[PDB]
Ligand binder design. Structure first.
Ligand SMILES: Nc1nc2c(ncn2[C@@H]2O[C@H](COP(=O)(O)OP(=O)(O)OP(=O)(O)O)[C@@H](O)[C@H]2O)c(=O)[nH]1
Ligand SMILES: [Mg+2]
Length: 175
């Protein structure tokens, strides 16, 4: 009965937006307020008991904030099947930069069938433009599968956001 999957998932976004902390909360249920800046790429494995016929493992690639200015993202993205694209809900510079990351991603990697990999937008630090129709419009226009406000600090919506992205990866993996 049981089926096991291993998926490569990217976590990308500007310096200091929370990439590392969202992964540490989701995988280890821990949070530190102390900023330790990531160098290049860091990794985690999440093991998700999806349901009774399904075990999913995620290989989480934590891409550091500077890496879009370097020349290695094509290597980093290779064979990814999903992405979280993370900004800091308090700092608009980090929101403007999400399209730079999103365009980098869509230039460099696609699913085996040629489509864009699903990508979910995480507005992180929600604990610190609050808009229902606007979200939908933005995601449609820039090819995001959905959008969640998150807190790594208070553990808000990180689990739901992950399950949402995994759900899209599973449909694509069956298709
Ligand atoms: N209040 C609050 N602070 C957060 C949250 N997520 C991250 N932080 C803080 O924001 C700072 C940056 O978090 P990191 O997870 O290191 O950021 P990063 O995106 O991994 O940064 P780079 O490694 O430089 O790419 C840290 O001090 C965190 O404690 C959150 O949900 N709420
Ligand atoms: Mg980091």
């Amino acid at each position: 009965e049981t089926r096991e999957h291993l998926f490569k998932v990217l976590v990308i976004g500007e310096l200091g937006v929370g990439k590392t902390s969202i992964i540490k909360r989701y995988v280890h249920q821990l949070f530190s307020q102390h900023y330790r800046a990531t160098i290049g790429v860091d990794f985690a494995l999440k093991v998700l008991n999806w349901d009774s016929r399904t075990l999913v493992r995620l290989q989480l690639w934590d891409i550091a904030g500077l890496e879009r200015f370097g020349n290695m993202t094509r290597v980093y993205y290779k064979e990814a099947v999903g992405a979280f694209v993370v900004f800091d809900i308090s700092r608009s510079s980090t929101f403007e930069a999400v399209l730079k990351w999103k365009s980098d991603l869509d230039s460099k990697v696609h699913l085996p069938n040629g489509s864009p990999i699903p990508a979910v937008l995480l507005a992180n630090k929600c604990d610190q433009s609050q808009s229902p129709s606007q979200v939908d419009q933005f995601c449609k226009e820039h090819g995001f599968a959905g959008w969640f406000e998150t807190s790594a600090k208070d553990n808000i919506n990180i689990e739901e956001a992950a399950r949402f992205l995994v759900e899209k990866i599973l449909v694509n993996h069956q298709s």
